[PDB]
Design a protein around this ligand. Structure first.
Ligand SMILES: [Mg+2]
Ligand SMILES: [Mg+2]
Ligand SMILES: [Mg+2]
Ligand SMILES: [Mg+2]
Ligand SMILES: [Mg+2]
Ligand SMILES: [Mg+2]
Ligand SMILES: [Mg+2]
Ligand SMILES: [Mg+2]
Ligand SMILES: [Mg+2]
Ligand SMILES: [Mg+2]
Ligand SMILES: [Mg+2]
Ligand SMILES: [Mg+2]
Ligand SMILES: [Mg+2]
Ligand SMILES: [Mg+2]
Ligand SMILES: [Mg+2]
Ligand SMILES: [Mg+2]
Ligand SMILES: [Mg+2]
Ligand SMILES: [Mg+2]
Ligand SMILES: [Mg+2]
Ligand SMILES: [Mg+2]
Ligand SMILES: [Mg+2]
Ligand SMILES: [Mg+2]
Ligand SMILES: [Mg+2]
Ligand SMILES: [Mg+2]
Ligand SMILES: [Mg+2]
Ligand SMILES: [Mg+2]
Ligand SMILES: [Mg+2]
Ligand SMILES: [Mg+2]
Ligand SMILES: [Mg+2]
Ligand SMILES: [Mg+2]
Ligand SMILES: [Mg+2]
Ligand SMILES: [Mg+2]
Lengths: 185, 51, 156, 53, 222, 148
RNA sequence: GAAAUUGUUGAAAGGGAAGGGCAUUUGAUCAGACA
RNA sequence: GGAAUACUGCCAGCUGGGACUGAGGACUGCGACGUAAGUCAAGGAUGCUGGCAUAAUGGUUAUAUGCCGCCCGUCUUGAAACACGGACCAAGGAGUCUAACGUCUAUGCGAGUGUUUGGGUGUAAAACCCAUACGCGUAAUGAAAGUGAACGUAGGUUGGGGCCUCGCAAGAGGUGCACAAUCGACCGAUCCUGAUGUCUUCGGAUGGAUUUGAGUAAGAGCAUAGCUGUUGGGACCCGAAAG
RNA sequence: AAAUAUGUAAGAAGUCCUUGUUACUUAAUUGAACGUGGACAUUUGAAUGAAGAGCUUUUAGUGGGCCAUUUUUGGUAAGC
């Protein structure tokens, strides 16, 4: 017998393949698996892990976040890589010319890019242009801003958007939300 | 694939610790003590036998 | 289709044995075996027959003669672990030294040349026994364990 | 313990080396020789029982 | 290029000279150990002749073998035993005898056996049951190359180099000793010497500080 | 699908995963919302505070169309202009010949401001506007015009 | 034309139930390779 | 006075007998020996001899012998229980489906999304194609009348993967998305402040704050599908006394 | 006034130097808090150990307990 001190047969608990059965995506990971092994460039490692991530962690990054990324002092000319999809944004007018790479590309994202002289390359294209991931700038969509998240941690005094189906007066606003009706949260 | 024990398999006694040969040659596991001859003070052997 | 298809088949190819490092060395026969020593057989048709040890062959065996005119034991071989050596020995020069070896026994109902090499080394050694009293009779008699003989304490 | 840890850190890096800046726990005693001269040992036996009440 | 008949001898000279470096080193130790024991012999002889008493330095190194299984153990000894990497009946770890470990021993005394190991048994222990920790993975020593690949940073290149750090409790004893896996000892070949183990050694038992006797016990389990 | 569902795996286990001691009974707590003020109070006063009581004033026969004023932000004002006319109206920032967009015919009732425009001045005719959004389209040259 | 249950025939065992586990003996039975 | 011996301990001293094991399958490694070739017990068994190719060996089965083995299912702190159900066999026999939901994952498309009420069309309940609207989302917040999200490079600080530059390198700098902590700004509620004005009671700039909001602060949703969980339903199956 | 148990501390989130901001503070550039720049990596500031740490979402069963050592209350006591 052994007085174990960690719990036996524990799974590491990170993905090691997308739950997807996309034949193209499994092939994309067939590549970066090899890139992360034999090149030991960080960018390759940080990109293999991000291929597994579920939709909820490949949140969209919009042409407008990109354009603001290409305004950090030192970036403007960078093949810019998004391992989720990329979304158009009509709230920006000016959009710099760039070569950006992403998994899926939305209709309006190409229009703002190719018709700004930009390029939209798949992720294996970006592999050949930057094998060791040279001169890249990884951008990540905002994770803790989905609808489900404003409900997590719900509780007294944490003020956290109750799980409700119909909003507005007469719905979960009377007692324990104002002092005229009992108390507040 | 198989830990081979030194202290048997005298070959592997030599893969590590080459000085193993010198010890055996000079014997050195039975190094003879240079004789000396000091003798205890009376006080020592007097308390020893003391009631 | 009855079992569709096993997508892999083990490669029928035979891959080479690994290079071993177990090389030989000759037996370090126990001291008790020195030629011209009388021996007790514990096995075979010649279980019990007392016999004479002559020469250690190169396939680890031993070479014995009764001899034939004494206790019927031809020139033969015995395994070194099925036999006991005793504290009584005889002489070895004044008798043949090198005639016999392994292939002599590989044969290709008696055989008549064999009968001869027998008598050859026979009489050069039947000479040696007569020199000690009560010795052919000893070697003529077979060996047996009487009641109450404890072989862990009996010396030979 | 730190204001005097740097005070060591100057002279111990000016005049030389061997900082030894972290503390260390109590250490097992080192070899020593104790004399019987003037201190010849007193021999002791246990005591018999009595009551004295 | 070729670089095939341009390399081999470069490695071996770095190697063949590394072994002659070790052989120089172990001989230094051999004299070092024997000078030191002979010196404490004569110190006792001198003091006895002087009329004084030579008292040896309190040991700074003990060997601790857990002699009690894993069920029904109170939470505080249970933790200490883990902090000494003693989590399985019949396994061994060395420890530097300081105060902050003197007290760790007092707490687990009912569950372990320990004493003052001789050079003779640290040698057999490491030669037979020595294994080092490389990414977990419990690796058997079997080649000073493995020792240098993890202790060269500290000036330990051979196996006897290690053994030296242990019994001399060198200034890198911690990371040297923590390199060693807990020795998976067997049960004693001649037995324990006692009817019931779980009495203190002083009381005809087996647990606690049995000083120099820790060497009889370990070699049989070794 | 049934095959993918745990009840196939619970076959052969006596309690079927619902417990030997406490069992799977019929309605151990009461049906529905029962007990919200009594023995499910904690789960309401927490996860659903404000559940009990009345807060507002009432509106008999409130008709929702009465309040239909979809909100539009300067952050997206230029989305009401087709691309074939965005190509040439992006240049020529002319006070004469401004682009006029009727937001009500687009589907909104109030124009709020949140996100900055280019200085190309536009005529916008809406029902209502926020003070600042006008105060910034007049900063781009344009004018808010009012309709119904 | 199943099972429970039953007749006959055959083998076997059986000192106040029977059945099972590991191991082997006996019996019965099935197996075993190409200059 | 001078020896021996016991006890205890070391030896990388030598050596005899017995037992279980042979995993791996070209070569790569560390060594030893050697003047070299090469040889070795050095990253796991080979050699010689003999019997068997049918009944060696082994599997199954029944019996016998040794030791061992209470009756399962159930509630229970505790069941072999002098607790309950069960004489035997067959067949049947219990967490379903639906409405609306939470989380998670897959998928489409993405500041949008949803063809299937309906229309078109057909090889006719399929498939295929379409207009207008409608649902949710893109705005919040007040009980309401209402008002309604950039001082700033959509800010400051600390931390930050990756990327860029200097360097054989240890490192140093630069930029730093997601994420977290903090301090600000913005919108609504509140309570103050109450200018230019003026239908003397209307208007509410400006400036605020131990107050407050399911907010803004370069949108992330919508639809389908699955498991799991939720509520209403005969609601896992069988069971009242009653009304 | 013990023993056993118990709070905190053992550094880079650090130590100090000349001096910037404000409506708070002082008689006072007095102080308070927050800062630009500048000065110090072996033994980075005890020991030991770390199949690595920090963090989130969802949901099961459970919510009759019982025993032993020691401390212990009621009871003469109890398999209480
Ligand atoms: Mg186990
Ligand atoms: Mg377990
Ligand atoms: Mg009231
Ligand atoms: Mg024994
Ligand atoms: Mg015992
Ligand atoms: Mg179970
Ligand atoms: Mg369950
Ligand atoms: Mg049940
Ligand atoms: Mg329950
Ligand atoms: Mg219950
Ligand atoms: Mg019929
Ligand atoms: Mg039948
Ligand atoms: Mg009979
Ligand atoms: Mg009877
Ligand atoms: Mg001895
Ligand atoms: Mg020995
Ligand atoms: Mg029994
Ligand atoms: Mg009961
Ligand atoms: Mg039972
Ligand atoms: Mg009973
Ligand atoms: Mg009942
Ligand atoms: Mg019954
Ligand atoms: Mg059935
Ligand atoms: Mg809406
Ligand atoms: Mg029912
Ligand atoms: Mg009725
Ligand atoms: Mg009634
Ligand atoms: Mg998370
Ligand atoms: Mg739970
Ligand atoms: Mg529950
Ligand atoms: Mg629970
Ligand atoms: Mg106990």
């Amino acid at each position: 017998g052994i007085d174990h001190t960690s719990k036996q047969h524990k799974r590491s608990g990170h993905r090691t393949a997308p739950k997807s059965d996309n034949v193209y995506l499994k092939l994309l990971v067939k590549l970066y698996t090899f890139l992360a092994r034999r090149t030991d460039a960080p960018f390759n490692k940080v990109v293999l892990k991000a291929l597994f991530l579920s939709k909820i962690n490949r949140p969209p990054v919009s042409v407008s976040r990109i354009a603001r990324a290409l305004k950090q002092e030192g970036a403007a000319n960078k093949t810019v890589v998004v391992v989720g999809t990329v979304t158009d944004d009509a709230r920006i007018f000016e959009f710099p010319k760039t070569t950006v790479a992403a998994l899926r590309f939305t209709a309006g994202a190409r229009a703002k890019i190719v018709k700004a002289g930009g390029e939209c390359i798949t992720l294996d294209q970006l592999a050949v242009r930057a094998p060791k991931g040279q001169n890249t700038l990884i951008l990540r969509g905002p994770r803790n801003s989905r609808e489900a998240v404003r409900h997590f941690g719900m509780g007294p005094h944490k003020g956290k958007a109750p799980r409700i189906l119909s909003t507005g007066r007469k719905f979960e606003r009377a007692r324990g939300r104002r002092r005229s009706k009992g108390f507040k949260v | 694939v198989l830990k081979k024990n030194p202290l048997k398999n005298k070959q592997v006694l030599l893969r590590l610790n080459p000085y193993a040969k010198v010890f055996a040659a000079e014997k050195l596991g039975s190094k003879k003590a240079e004789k000396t001859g000091t003798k205890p003070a009376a006080v020592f052997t007097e308390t020893l036998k003391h009631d | 289709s009855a079992q569709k298809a096993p997508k892999w088949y083990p490669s029928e190819d035979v891959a080479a044995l690994k290079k071993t490092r177990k090389a030989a060395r000759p037996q370090k026969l126990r001291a008790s075996l020195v030629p011209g020593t009388v021996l007790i057989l514990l096995a075979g048709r010649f279980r019990g027959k007392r016999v004479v040890y002559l020469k250690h062959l190169e396939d680890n065996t031993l070479l014995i003669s009764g001899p034939f005119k004494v206790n019927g034991v031809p020139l033969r071989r015995v395994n070194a672990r099925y036999v006991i050596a005793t504290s009584t020995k005889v002489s070895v020069e004044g008798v043949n030294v090198e005639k016999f070896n392994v292939e002599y026994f590989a044969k290709e109902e008696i055989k008549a040349e064999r009968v001869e090499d027998q008598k050859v080394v026979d009489k050069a050694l039947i000479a040696e026994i007569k020199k000690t009293p009560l010795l052919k009779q000893y070697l003529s008699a077979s060996f047996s364990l009487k009641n109450g003989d404890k072989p862990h304490m009996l010396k030979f | 313990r730190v204001k005097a840890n740097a005070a060591k850190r100057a002279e111990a890096k000016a005049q030389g080396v061997a900082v030894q800046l972290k503390r260390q726990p109590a250490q097992p005693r080192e070899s020593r020789i104790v004399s019987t001269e003037g201190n010849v040992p007193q021999t002791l036996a246990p005591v018999p029982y009595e009551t004295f009440i | 290029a070729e670089q095939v008949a341009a390399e081999r001898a470069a490695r071996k000279a770095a190697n063949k000279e590394k072994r002659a470096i070790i052989l120089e080193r172990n001989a230094a130790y051999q004299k070092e150990y024997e000078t030191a024991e002979r010196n404490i012999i004569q110190a006792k002889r001198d003091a006895k002749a002087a009329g004084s008493y030579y008292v040896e330095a309190q040991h700074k190194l003990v060997f601790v073998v857990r002699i009690k299984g894993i069920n029904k153990i109170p939470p505080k000894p249970r933790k200490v035993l883990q902090l000494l990497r003693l989590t399985r009946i019949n396994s061994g770890t060395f420890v530097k005898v300081t105060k902050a470990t003197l007290e760790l021993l007092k707490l687990i005394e009912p569950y372990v056996a320990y004493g003052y190991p001789s050079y003779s048994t640290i040698r057999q222990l490491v030669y037979k049951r020595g294994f080092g920790k490389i990414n977990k993975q419990r690796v058997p020593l079997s080649d000073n190359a493995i020792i240098e690949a993890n202790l060269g940073k500290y000036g330990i290149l051979s196996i006897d180099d290690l053994i030296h750090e242990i019994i001399t409790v060198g200034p890198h004893f911690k990371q040297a000793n923590n390199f060693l896996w807990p020795f998976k000892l067997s049960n004693p070949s001649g037995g324990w010497g006692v009817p019931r183990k779980f009495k203190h050694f002083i009381q005809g038992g087996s647990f606690g500080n049995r000083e120099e006797f820790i060497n009889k016990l370990v070699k049989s389990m070794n | 699908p049934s095959r993918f569902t745990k009840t196939r795996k619970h076959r052969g286990h006596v309690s079927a995963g619902k417990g030997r001691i406490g069992k799977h009974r019929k309605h151990p707590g009461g049906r529905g919302m029962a007990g919200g003020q009594h023995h499910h109070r904690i789960n309401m006063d927490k996860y659903h505070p404000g559940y009990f009581g009345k807060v507002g004033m009432r509106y008999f026969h409130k008709q929702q169309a009465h309040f239909w004023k979809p909100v539009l932000n300067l952050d997206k004002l230029w989305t009401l202009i087709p691309e074939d006319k965005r190509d040439q109206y992006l240049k020529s920032a002319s006070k004469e010949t401004a682009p006029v967009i009727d937001t009500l015919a687009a589907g909104y009732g109030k124009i709020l401001g949140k996100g900055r425009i280019p200085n190309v001045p536009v005529i916008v005719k809406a029902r209502f506007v926020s003070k600042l959004a006008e105060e910034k389209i007049r900063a781009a040259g344009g004018v808010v015009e009012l309709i119904a």
